[PDB]
Scaffold this active site. Structure first.
Site, PDB file in Angstrom:
ATOM      1  N   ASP A   1       0.826  -1.208   0.000  1.00 43.98           N
ATOM      2  CA  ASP A   1       0.000   0.000   0.000  1.00 43.98           C
ATOM      3  C   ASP A   1       0.867   1.269   0.000  1.00 43.98           C
ATOM      4  OD1 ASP A   1      -2.628  -1.199  -0.040  1.00 43.98           O
ATOM      5  OD2 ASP A   1      -3.255  -0.291   1.838  1.00 43.98           O
TER       6      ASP A   1
ATOM      7  N   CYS B   1      -2.262   0.768 -13.504  1.00 50.93           N
ATOM      8  CA  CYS B   1      -2.319   0.762 -12.038  1.00 50.93           C
ATOM      9  C   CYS B   1      -3.497   1.682 -11.713  1.00 50.93           C
ATOM     10  CB  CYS B   1      -0.985   1.157 -11.443  1.00 50.93           C
ATOM     11  SG  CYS B   1      -0.129   2.620 -12.185  1.00 50.93           S
TER      12      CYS B   1
ATOM     13  N   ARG C   1       3.669   2.632 -10.871  1.00 54.00           N
ATOM     14  CA  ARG C   1       3.942   1.200 -11.048  1.00 54.00           C
ATOM     15  C   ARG C   1       3.958   0.818 -12.525  1.00 54.00           C
ATOM     16  NH1 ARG C   1      -0.396  -0.844  -6.412  1.00 54.00           N
ATOM     17  NH2 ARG C   1       0.254   0.758  -4.910  1.00 54.00           N
ATOM     18  N   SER C   2       3.027   1.371 -13.310  1.00 52.33           N
ATOM     19  CA  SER C   2       2.978   1.045 -14.747  1.00 52.33           C
ATOM     20  C   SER C   2       4.263   1.476 -15.446  1.00 52.33           C
ATOM     21  CB  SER C   2       1.767   1.711 -15.402  1.00 52.33           C
ATOM     22  OG  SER C   2       0.489   1.155 -15.023  1.00 52.33           O
TER      23      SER C   2
ATOM     24  N   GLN D   1       6.826   7.930 -10.297  1.00 54.85           N
ATOM     25  CA  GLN D   1       6.162   8.980  -9.510  1.00 54.85           C
ATOM     26  C   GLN D   1       6.964   9.465  -8.315  1.00 54.85           C
ATOM     27  OE1 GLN D   1       2.147   6.988  -9.138  1.00 54.85           O
ATOM     28  NE2 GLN D   1       1.458   9.130  -9.276  1.00 54.85           N
TER      29      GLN D   1
END
Length: 284
Positions: free
Chosen positions: A181, A215, A221-222, A262
């Protein structure tokens, strides 16, 4: 410079935030006018994450052709990817229309439907064989064929039917279920194992349309997934693998979608994944 030495250098000097902000400063800025039209407000999950006009995927309909999705075309590596946001309640039909029209074989999902107690994307595929889904706005039917649940990921076989023509196609759903998370994984081993399962399926290969990867926003994440894949392929193809420059590859991908990677932690994790993955690419 061998990225492994570059890595230790940044780690000892603790300058990851500085490296990452340099990337943000040099990244491309292209218009995203279609994404910002008033008629598209409920087609975007996040106000600050939009596809560039020049690389956006267009839906094949005269009404409204807009989806929050981008084509990342890597010319030297000979790989293409579609990066998109997690589907919204009002865009699940558009999402499967794109998969159909772009002739994709695989969908790669890097988030859970709920994370941190909030919804991160719609439940856009069926959970039981006998309870299929029909998307009336785009005239598609979607059926669960089989499910294989493993410790770090789940793979599903799905049937997508174009109800207008009764053509059917098999789509593979690759769902990485264990990204934490908060933060990034401690080791890249399970993420690399997952990448290799996607490769082994054919879903990244030139006989199919581009893989669809998402994502929640389709940039963090992508971005890690496509950056790691492309860097490892380039290390395989070139005479000098130490010539692969992960920061230069990331800036090339940012010509096609904003914001890829990110956080400085995601940047460090991407380095770690490529360094550890190379110890198979080079022959082990």
């Amino acid at each position: 410079m061998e990225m492994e030495k570059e890595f230790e250098q940044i780690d000892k000097s603790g300058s990851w935030a500085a490296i990452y902000q340099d990337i943000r400063h040099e990244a491309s800025d292209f218009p995203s006018r279609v994404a910002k039209l008033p008629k598209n407000k409920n087609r975007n999950r996040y106000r600050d994450v939009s596809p560039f006009d020049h690389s956006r995927i267009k839906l094949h309909q005269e009404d409204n052709d807009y989806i929050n999705a981008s084509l990342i075309k890597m010319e030297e590596a000979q790989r293409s990817y579609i990066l998109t946001q997690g589907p919204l309640p009002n865009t699940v039909g558009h999402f499967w229309e794109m998969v159909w029209e772009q002739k994709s074989r695989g969908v790669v999902m890097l988030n859970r439907v709920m994370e941190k107690g909030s919804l991160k994307c719609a439940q856009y595929w069926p959970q039981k064989e006998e309870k299929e889904m029909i998307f009336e706005d785009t005239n598609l039917k979607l059926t669960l064929i089989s499910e294989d649940i493993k410790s770090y990921y789940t793979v599903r076989q799905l049937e997508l039917e174009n109800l207008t023509t009764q053509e059917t196609r098999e789509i593979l759903h690759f769902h990485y279920t264990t990204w934490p998370d908060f933060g990034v994984p401690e080791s890249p081993a399970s993420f690399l194992n997952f990448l290799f399962k996607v490769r082994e399926s054919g879903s990244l290969s030139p006989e199919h349309g581009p893989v669809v990867v998402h994502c929640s926003a389709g940039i963090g994440r992508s971005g890690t997934f496509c950056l790691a894949d492309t860097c490892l392929l380039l290390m395989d193809k070139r005479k000098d693998p130490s010539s692969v420059d992960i920061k230069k590859v990331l800036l090339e991908m940012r010509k096609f979608r904003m914001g890829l990677i990110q956080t400085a932690d995601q940047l460090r994790f991407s380095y770690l994944a490529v360094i550890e993955g190379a110890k198979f690419i080079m022959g082990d």
